[PDB]
Design an enzyme around this catalytic site. Structure first.
Site, short mmCIF file in Angstrom:
data_model
loop_
_atom_site.label_atom_id
_atom_site.label_comp_id
_atom_site.label_asym_id
_atom_site.label_seq_id
_atom_site.Cartn_x
_atom_site.Cartn_y
_atom_site.Cartn_z
N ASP A 8 -11.35 -12.62 12.16
CA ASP A 8 -10.14 -11.91 11.70
C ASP A 8 -9.74 -12.52 10.35
O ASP A 8 -10.22 -13.59 9.94
CB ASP A 8 -8.95 -11.98 12.68
CG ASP A 8 -7.83 -10.98 12.36
OD1 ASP A 8 -8.12 -9.95 11.73
OD2 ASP A 8 -6.69 -11.22 12.76
N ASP A 10 -5.90 -12.35 8.92
CA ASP A 10 -4.59 -13.00 9.11
C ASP A 10 -4.66 -14.04 10.23
O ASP A 10 -5.09 -13.73 11.35
CB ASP A 10 -3.49 -11.96 9.35
CG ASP A 10 -2.10 -12.58 9.50
OD1 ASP A 10 -1.67 -13.32 8.59
OD2 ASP A 10 -1.40 -12.21 10.47
N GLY A 46 1.43 -6.05 14.66
CA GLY A 46 0.43 -5.19 15.32
C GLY A 46 0.93 -3.78 15.60
O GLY A 46 0.25 -3.02 16.25
N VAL A 47 2.12 -3.44 15.09
CA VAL A 47 2.78 -2.14 15.29
C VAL A 47 2.49 -1.28 14.05
O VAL A 47 2.33 -1.81 12.95
CB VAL A 47 4.29 -2.37 15.50
CG1 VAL A 47 5.10 -1.08 15.52
CG2 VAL A 47 4.57 -3.19 16.74
N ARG A 49 3.09 1.16 10.79
CA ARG A 49 4.08 1.18 9.71
C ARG A 49 5.29 2.04 10.15
O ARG A 49 6.44 1.63 9.99
CB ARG A 49 3.38 1.64 8.42
CG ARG A 49 4.19 1.52 7.14
CD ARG A 49 3.41 2.02 5.93
NE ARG A 49 2.10 1.39 5.75
CZ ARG A 49 1.03 1.97 5.22
NH1 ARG A 49 1.10 3.18 4.69
NH2 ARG A 49 -0.12 1.33 5.19
N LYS A 117 -5.98 -3.00 5.97
CA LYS A 117 -6.41 -1.92 5.09
C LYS A 117 -6.81 -2.43 3.69
O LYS A 117 -7.37 -1.69 2.88
CB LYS A 117 -5.31 -0.85 5.01
CG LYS A 117 -4.87 -0.31 6.37
CD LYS A 117 -3.76 0.74 6.29
CE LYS A 117 -3.50 1.41 7.62
NZ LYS A 117 -2.94 0.45 8.60
N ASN A 118 -6.57 -3.73 3.41
CA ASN A 118 -6.87 -4.31 2.09
C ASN A 118 -7.90 -5.45 2.23
O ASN A 118 -7.95 -6.35 1.35
CB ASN A 118 -5.58 -4.82 1.43
CG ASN A 118 -4.52 -3.74 1.35
OD1 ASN A 118 -4.59 -2.87 0.45
ND2 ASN A 118 -3.55 -3.81 2.25
#
Ligand code: NA
EC number: 5.4.2.6
Length: 219
Positions: A8, A10, A46-47, A49, A117-118
């Site tokens: 992972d 983060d 983890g939710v 946007r 996403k980045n």
């Protein structure tokens, strides 16, 4: 011997959670809502946007149009992307560059299994691109962590089965995803959060090639 390591981003390679929190807090201040602190921010991890924005509006029972909602959400994303322009190689967690060097020199495949996403951009900013054999695209999985899909995708992209792989994570959902993929988890954090049935190290400086090899042999 294991053939790949699935990372992972983060909580393992660097901290992105701090920038999401700063972007949500700035948004809330702009629209005049109080109470977006780091404790509250635990409910946004983890939710989606959209669901995160709704939790912020609910703090003040605040109603907005569908239009305004779409654009407040995009505004927070635009601010987050601005903030991560400053990420550099100095932001890589202790132990991680040396692990990448040792895996590469021993012909062990290296893949990213992140919801970010980045991800490609962040690895370029940290000068890590040249170590990675693949990055799993989170836009192409049908289910997010704790589903195993993103770990399956990362393994497959480097030509291996999860069963041939170790996964590194700091979250309960990510550890479950590694378990259900068939890979071997090694968590970073504490067993109170991540479980008693896996090996856990207290920080990333413990993630060494020698240690990963010991854990694989003992499994
Ligand atoms: Na993580």
């Amino acid at each position: 011997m294991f053939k790949a390591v699935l990372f992972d981003l983060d909580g393992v390679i660097t901290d992105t959670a701090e920038y999401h929190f700063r972007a949500w807090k700035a948004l809330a201040e702009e629209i005049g809502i109080n109470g977006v602190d780091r404790q509250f921010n635990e409910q946004l991890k983890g939710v989606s946007r959209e669901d995160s924005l709704q939790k912020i509006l609910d703090l003040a029972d605040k109603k907005v149009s569908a239009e305004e909602f779409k654009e407040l959400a995009k505004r927070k994303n635009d601010n987050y992307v601005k903030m991560i322009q400053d990420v550099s190689p100095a932001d890589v967690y202790p132990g991680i560059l040396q692990l990448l060097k040792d895996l590469r020199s021993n012909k062990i495949k290296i893949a990213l299994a992140s919801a970010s996403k980045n991800g490609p951009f962040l690895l370029e900013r940290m000068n890590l691109t040249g170590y990675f054999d693949a990055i799993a695209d989170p836009a192409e999985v049908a289910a997010s962590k704790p589903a195993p899909d993103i770990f399956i995708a990362a393994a497959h992209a480097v030509g291996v089965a999860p069963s041939e792989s170790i996964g590194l994570e700091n979250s309960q959902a990510g550890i479950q995803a590694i378990k259900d993929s068939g890979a071997l988890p090694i968590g970073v954090g504490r067993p109170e959060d991540l479980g008693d049935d896996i090996v856990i190290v207290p920080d990333t400086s413990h993630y060494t090639l020698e240690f990963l090899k010991e854990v694989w042999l003992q499994k």
